[PDB]
Write a protein that binds this DNA or RNA. Structure first.
Ligand SMILES: [K+]
Ligand SMILES: [K+]
Ligand SMILES: [Mg+2]
Ligand SMILES: [Mg+2]
Ligand SMILES: [Mg+2]
Ligand SMILES: [Mg+2]
Ligand SMILES: [Mg+2]
Ligand SMILES: [Mg+2]
Ligand SMILES: [Mg+2]
Ligand SMILES: [Mg+2]
Ligand SMILES: [Mg+2]
Ligand SMILES: [Mg+2]
Ligand SMILES: [Mg+2]
Ligand SMILES: [Mg+2]
Ligand SMILES: [Mg+2]
Ligand SMILES: [Mg+2]
Ligand SMILES: [Mg+2]
Ligand SMILES: [Mg+2]
Ligand SMILES: [Mg+2]
Ligand SMILES: [Mg+2]
Ligand SMILES: [Mg+2]
Ligand SMILES: [Mg+2]
Ligand SMILES: [Mg+2]
Ligand SMILES: [Mg+2]
Ligand SMILES: [Mg+2]
Ligand SMILES: [Mg+2]
Ligand SMILES: [Mg+2]
Ligand SMILES: [Mg+2]
Ligand SMILES: [Mg+2]
Ligand SMILES: [Mg+2]
Ligand SMILES: [Mg+2]
Ligand SMILES: [Mg+2]
Ligand SMILES: [Mg+2]
Ligand SMILES: [Mg+2]
Ligand SMILES: [Mg+2]
Ligand SMILES: [Mg+2]
Ligand SMILES: [Mg+2]
Ligand SMILES: [Mg+2]
Ligand SMILES: [Mg+2]
Ligand SMILES: [Mg+2]
Ligand SMILES: [Mg+2]
Ligand SMILES: [Mg+2]
Ligand SMILES: [Mg+2]
Ligand SMILES: [Mg+2]
Ligand SMILES: [Mg+2]
Ligand SMILES: [Mg+2]
Ligand SMILES: [Mg+2]
Ligand SMILES: [Mg+2]
Ligand SMILES: [Mg+2]
Ligand SMILES: [Mg+2]
Ligand SMILES: [Mg+2]
Ligand SMILES: [Mg+2]
Ligand SMILES: [Mg+2]
Ligand SMILES: [Mg+2]
Ligand SMILES: [Mg+2]
Ligand SMILES: [Mg+2]
Ligand SMILES: [Mg+2]
Ligand SMILES: [Mg+2]
Ligand SMILES: [Mg+2]
Ligand SMILES: [Mg+2]
Ligand SMILES: [Mg+2]
Ligand SMILES: [Mg+2]
Ligand SMILES: [Mg+2]
Ligand SMILES: [Mg+2]
Ligand SMILES: [Mg+2]
Ligand SMILES: [Mg+2]
Ligand SMILES: [Mg+2]
Ligand SMILES: [Mg+2]
Ligand SMILES: [Mg+2]
Ligand SMILES: [Mg+2]
Ligand SMILES: [Mg+2]
Ligand SMILES: [Mg+2]
Ligand SMILES: [Mg+2]
Ligand SMILES: [Mg+2]
Ligand SMILES: [Mg+2]
Ligand SMILES: [Mg+2]
Ligand SMILES: [Mg+2]
Ligand SMILES: [Mg+2]
Ligand SMILES: [Mg+2]
Ligand SMILES: [Mg+2]
Ligand SMILES: [Mg+2]
Ligand SMILES: [Mg+2]
Ligand SMILES: [Mg+2]
Ligand SMILES: [Mg+2]
Ligand SMILES: [Mg+2]
Ligand SMILES: [Mg+2]
Ligand SMILES: [Mg+2]
Ligand SMILES: [Mg+2]
Ligand SMILES: [Mg+2]
Ligand SMILES: [Mg+2]
Ligand SMILES: [Mg+2]
Ligand SMILES: [Mg+2]
Ligand SMILES: [Mg+2]
Ligand SMILES: [Mg+2]
Ligand SMILES: [Mg+2]
Ligand SMILES: [Mg+2]
Ligand SMILES: [Mg+2]
Ligand SMILES: [Mg+2]
Ligand SMILES: [Mg+2]
Ligand SMILES: [Mg+2]
Ligand SMILES: [Mg+2]
Ligand SMILES: [Mg+2]
Ligand SMILES: [Mg+2]
Ligand SMILES: [Mg+2]
Ligand SMILES: [Mg+2]
Ligand SMILES: [Mg+2]
Ligand SMILES: [Mg+2]
Ligand SMILES: [Mg+2]
Ligand SMILES: [Mg+2]
Ligand SMILES: [Mg+2]
Ligand SMILES: [Mg+2]
Ligand SMILES: [Mg+2]
Ligand SMILES: [Mg+2]
Ligand SMILES: [Mg+2]
Ligand SMILES: [Mg+2]
Ligand SMILES: [Mg+2]
Ligand SMILES: [Mg+2]
Ligand SMILES: [Mg+2]
Ligand SMILES: [Mg+2]
Lengths: 102, 141, 109, 150, 55, 115
RNA sequence: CCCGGCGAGGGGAGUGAAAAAGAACCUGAAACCGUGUACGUACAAGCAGUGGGAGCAUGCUUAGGCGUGUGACUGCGUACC
RNA sequence: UGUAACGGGGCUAAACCAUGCACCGAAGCUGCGGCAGCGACGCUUAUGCGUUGUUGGGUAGGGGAGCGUUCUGUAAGCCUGUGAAGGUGUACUGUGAGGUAUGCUGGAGGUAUCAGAAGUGCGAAUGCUGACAUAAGUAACGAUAAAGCGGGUGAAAAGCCC
């Protein structure tokens, strides 16, 4: 049932139904996305690739949320050279629910 | 998606026997350490003792190349005022033939609690009889 | 009922009184009162008088019954220290602390 | 600060941090490094800037419709009760009643009223014109202020 | 002489582990009067092994 | 205008002592010591976001190298086998497949055996 | 009123809006010291954390998983001025 | 002080030579997301950007923009005994200094906004004052002239009284 696909400059081994967090997409809050970048599909018989991507495989997903992650603190500190720096960071994400491993 | 880690309670432990008779010390020891650490398993996790139990029988018959039967020395300090005790590879096998493999494996394991935990897995023996026939330890080469 | 009693400003340091109070903890009042009779310490007499008070305290005011009464919470807290000059050799002075303790006992069932 | 210029203890030998006075600001009780002094904060303002500013703020009262210009504005007798009753007709409460001929009857009936100030046409101010919600100016006062600002 | 750098709550506690003093848990009972006392010691009233031997 | 500074200082110390919560001894209790701990924690935290991406790659590589040698091929030849077959799949997932779906994984080792 | 030595001190009673406003009296921080719980800890070496991470305890929901508390093992890592 | 002149185990290749091909390997480069500086540029417009190029390690030091504290004006306004300031948690929230909301404690003050002024921010100065630790329940308890017992008083007696 499971399938592999490349999204936010990186790949996810996803099953049908389960939610997946991934890097922010230019999509609305409750629209839909099609990944034709599918790298692998597994079942009884595995449809692996001798080329880039499969052939007629498309992962259809529905966008759930559009949040920001946990705040990461960034402390740059140079011992004895009168230098330190502080910086927050909340990375943006997009939860997608998978609704079709073709 | 967080990756898999082998959870101790779920870890499958296998038993093995290795006959060291004529085998090269380092090349045996290495292949032992690889197994004892659990590197061969696809569920390898560095902070868990995934490796297998190994019985090394016929330790005394282990072979060494060149002049290392006489030349290879095993030093150790007694923790005393001037107590440095040495012992050649012959003298080592004459007295304690289990130590030869033990020391060669222990050096190749990691250092620390898990390193010591994965040494416990190893069971060296001077003779050919082993009293672990309960576990059905299968033959390894 | 819990029925507290406590000696505040008890002229004995915490560390010493707290040594006795570790004997009596989750013990029957009758068994605890005995111990302090045969504990050879100044804080035993100091801690007993609080417990023996906490029993009368418990029986008269609230709960009654001496048989079913255990020391549930005993504790010693460090009270105010009285500073004093203790003069030493070569002119130099030290500030010695006459320490006090707050002894509480809680006699429940 | 009161105290002596004695060294509390000598420079060496003691383990203490080398001190020179009981009055030093790093010591408790006495010091304050850069003590204050009485000082004239009255900063200088160019005549033309002051006039220009009045001319400016006095023109925004026309745009914003705060400036209620009127004919003769004077109360009957020195009584706050009356002045209070006559501002109720005009829908006024917070005001700066600027007048040419400063009359005792009016000036003495606006002391106790907190929301009513009665300046003379000569004694208008930058902050006052801005502060008050309306400005009820007398035709003579407009004529005096016109000639004053120019 | 003199510590290089101060010990902790922890160490101090570890040291005090053995300072905990033990109770008696071994009180006798006089045959006649039935009064509690230390073994091989007389009672408060003045008994030892069921016989008054003191005023 | 004299400015007392007890309200602010306390808030500033109390903030850092909240980040030092969990640390041994003075490192949780004592601002002067905590503040160092909280900085070094941040330095190490910044460092280890870099090291996390290294450690896991190693971890995966060692899983793949184990799982491939059960099928008779070493990691070095396997990745060249995959790259010469233009397979774009990463170490993260290969290591995930190696553990979970070995019957699937075997197909990649055959796919690599072609090249 | 009670315990204690007609003690100190305390528990009740009562006064008060309030008595952790009881004269050591508004608020009552921190260091420091305890008592109680949860988890860890008696074959393990080092700036004591940080990446990773099992288990146990937990509140929730719910038949999803979390959030916390702890932190066995493990990679890296010699405070600040 | 101890093997102590491969880091170690251990190796006749796990050594050297020569050739090849893989592969690992960094905060390098690439990918994806986000922020900022600077130049352009279509010429937008008074700047958001189809962008477009590119920078963005940093001590002394220069330049730019901010947060927060007490005080003055806006304020006889606004918020507050249906709970202020303060204290103590929690949860959100901004690149940061921070901010917001709120449970408990507290029991009367607080203050938006945009301005104005500073005793405007502390970890170090063998800084200053108070508190509190540590060593530690450790050394010590001040002449090595000496106590002992019986009775008395007393809550209690080695020390007080006879
Ligand atoms: K209070
Ligand atoms: K180390
Ligand atoms: Mg932050
Ligand atoms: Mg290492
Ligand atoms: Mg002396
Ligand atoms: Mg003297
Ligand atoms: Mg002189
Ligand atoms: Mg000193
Ligand atoms: Mg002064
Ligand atoms: Mg000036
Ligand atoms: Mg030192
Ligand atoms: Mg304890
Ligand atoms: Mg001791
Ligand atoms: Mg008897
Ligand atoms: Mg003031
Ligand atoms: Mg401040
Ligand atoms: Mg912890
Ligand atoms: Mg704390
Ligand atoms: Mg890497
Ligand atoms: Mg590749
Ligand atoms: Mg009575
Ligand atoms: Mg009485
Ligand atoms: Mg009495
Ligand atoms: Mg008396
Ligand atoms: Mg009486
Ligand atoms: Mg009385
Ligand atoms: Mg009393
Ligand atoms: Mg009462
Ligand atoms: Mg009452
Ligand atoms: Mg009442
Ligand atoms: Mg109240
Ligand atoms: Mg009270
Ligand atoms: Mg009451
Ligand atoms: Mg209170
Ligand atoms: Mg009094
Ligand atoms: Mg006090
Ligand atoms: Mg008090
Ligand atoms: Mg007072
Ligand atoms: Mg009051
Ligand atoms: Mg108070
Ligand atoms: Mg208090
Ligand atoms: Mg506190
Ligand atoms: Mg437990
Ligand atoms: Mg346990
Ligand atoms: Mg356990
Ligand atoms: Mg254990
Ligand atoms: Mg253990
Ligand atoms: Mg240690
Ligand atoms: Mg270590
Ligand atoms: Mg650690
Ligand atoms: Mg379980
Ligand atoms: Mg469980
Ligand atoms: Mg956690
Ligand atoms: Mg290190
Ligand atoms: Mg290291
Ligand atoms: Mg030597
Ligand atoms: Mg060496
Ligand atoms: Mg030499
Ligand atoms: Mg090397
Ligand atoms: Mg060597
Ligand atoms: Mg060979
Ligand atoms: Mg050469
Ligand atoms: Mg070479
Ligand atoms: Mg070559
Ligand atoms: Mg990298
Ligand atoms: Mg880069
Ligand atoms: Mg590029
Ligand atoms: Mg980019
Ligand atoms: Mg820079
Ligand atoms: Mg800003
Ligand atoms: Mg601003
Ligand atoms: Mg503010
Ligand atoms: Mg103000
Ligand atoms: Mg004011
Ligand atoms: Mg006023
Ligand atoms: Mg109002
Ligand atoms: Mg109001
Ligand atoms: Mg309410
Ligand atoms: Mg309200
Ligand atoms: Mg309200
Ligand atoms: Mg409230
Ligand atoms: Mg309320
Ligand atoms: Mg409140
Ligand atoms: Mg104020
Ligand atoms: Mg507030
Ligand atoms: Mg509380
Ligand atoms: Mg707390
Ligand atoms: Mg509020
Ligand atoms: Mg409320
Ligand atoms: Mg209240
Ligand atoms: Mg008042
Ligand atoms: Mg007031
Ligand atoms: Mg007010
Ligand atoms: Mg406020
Ligand atoms: Mg203001
Ligand atoms: Mg000025
Ligand atoms: Mg200052
Ligand atoms: Mg400083
Ligand atoms: Mg300070
Ligand atoms: Mg004081
Ligand atoms: Mg003692
Ligand atoms: Mg000692
Ligand atoms: Mg001694
Ligand atoms: Mg002594
Ligand atoms: Mg003596
Ligand atoms: Mg003496
Ligand atoms: Mg004597
Ligand atoms: Mg008598
Ligand atoms: Mg008597
Ligand atoms: Mg008497
Ligand atoms: Mg008598
Ligand atoms: Mg009497
Ligand atoms: Mg009597
Ligand atoms: Mg009596
Ligand atoms: Mg007597
Ligand atoms: Mg006598
Ligand atoms: Mg004597
Ligand atoms: Mg006599
Ligand atoms: Mg006489």
């Amino acid at each position: 049932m499971y399938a592999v696909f490349q999204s936010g400059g990186k790949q996810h081994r996803v099953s049908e139904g389960q939610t997946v967090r991934l890097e922010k997409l230019d999509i609305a809050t409750g629209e839909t996305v099609e990944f034709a970048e599918v790298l692998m599909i597994a079942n009884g018989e595995e449809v692996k690739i001798g080329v880039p991507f499969v052939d007629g495989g498309v992962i259809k997903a529905e966008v759930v949320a559009h949040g920001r992650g946990e705040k990461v603190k960034i402390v740059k500190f140079r011992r004895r050279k009168h230098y330190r720096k502080q910086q927050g960071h909340r990375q943006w994400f997009t939860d997608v629910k998978i609704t079709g491993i073709s | 998606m967080k990756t898999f880690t082998a959870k101790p309670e779920t870890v499958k432990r296998d038993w093995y026997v290795v006959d060291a008779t004529g085998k090269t010390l380092g090349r045996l020891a290495t292949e032992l350490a690889r197994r004892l650490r659990g590197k061969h398993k696809a569920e390898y996790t560095p902070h868990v003792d995934t490796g297998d139990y190994i019985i090394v029988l016929n330790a005394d018959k282990v072979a060494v190349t060149g002049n290392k039967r006489t030349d290879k020395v095993y030093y150790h300090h007694t923790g005393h005022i001037g107590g440095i005790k040495q012992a050649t590879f012959e003298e080592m096998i004459a007295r304690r033939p289990e130590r030869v493999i033990e020391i060669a494996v222990k050096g190749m394991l990691p250092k620390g609690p898990l390193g010591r935990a994965m040494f416990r897995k190893l069971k060296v023996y001077a003779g050919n009889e082993h009293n672990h026939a309960a576990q059905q330890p299968q033959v390894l080469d | 009922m819990e029925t507290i009693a406590k000696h505040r400003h008890a002229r004995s340091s915490a560390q010493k009184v707290r040594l006795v109070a570790d004997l009596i903890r989750g013990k029957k009042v009758s068994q605890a009162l005995d111990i302090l009779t045969y504990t050879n310490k100044k804080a035993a007499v100091l801690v007993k008088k609080v417990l023996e008070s906490a029993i009368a305290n418990a029986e008269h005011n609230d709960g009654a019954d001496i048989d079913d009464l255990k020391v549930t919470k005993i504790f010693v807290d460090e009270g105010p220290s009285m500073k004093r000059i203790m003069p030493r050799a070569k002119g130099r002075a030290d500030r010695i602390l006459k320490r006090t303790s707050h002894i509480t006992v809680v006699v429940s069932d | 600060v009161t105290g002596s210029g004695k060294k509390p203890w000598r420079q060496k030998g003691t383990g203490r941090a080398r001190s020179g006075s009981i009055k030093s600001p790093i010591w408790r009780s006495g010091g304050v490094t850069f003590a204050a002094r009485p000082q004239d904060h009255s900063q200088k303002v160019n005549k033309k800037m002051y006039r220009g500013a009045l001319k400016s703020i006095l023109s925004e009262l026309v745009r914003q419709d705060r400036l209620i210009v009127v004919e003769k504005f004077s109360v009957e007798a020195p009584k706050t009760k009356l002045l209070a009753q006559k501002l109720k007709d005009m829908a006024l409460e917070d005001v700066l009643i600027i007048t040419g001929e400063l009359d005792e009857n009016l000036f003495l009936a606006a002391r106790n009223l907190h929301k009513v100030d009665v300046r003379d046409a000569t004694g208008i101010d930058p902050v006052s014109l801005i502060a008050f919600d309306k400005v009820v100016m007398t035709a003579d006062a407009v004529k005096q202020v016109e000639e004053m600002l120019a | 002489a003199v510590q290089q750098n101060k010990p902790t709550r922890s160490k101090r506690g570890m040291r005090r582990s053995h300072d905990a003093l033990t109770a008696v848990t071994s009180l006798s009972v006089d045959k006649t009067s039935g009064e509690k006392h230390l073994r091989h010691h007389i009672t408060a009233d003045g008994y030892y092994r069921g016989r008054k031997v003191i005023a | 205008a004299r400015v007392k500074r007890g309200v602010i200082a306390r808030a500033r110390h109390k903030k850092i002592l909240k980040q030092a919560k969990g640390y041994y001894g003075a490192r949780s209790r004592v601002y002067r010591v905590a503040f160092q701990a909280v900085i070094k924690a941040g330095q190490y935290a910044y460092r280890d976001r870099r090291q996390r991406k290294r450690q896991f790659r190693q971890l995966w590589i060692a899983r793949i190298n184990a799982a491939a040698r059960q099928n008779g091929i070493s990691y070095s030849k396997f990745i060249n086998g995959l790259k010469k077959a233009s397979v774009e799949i990463d170490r993260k997932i290969l290591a995930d497949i190696a553990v979970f779906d070995k019957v699937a994984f075997t197909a990649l080792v055959e796919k690599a055996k072609a090249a």
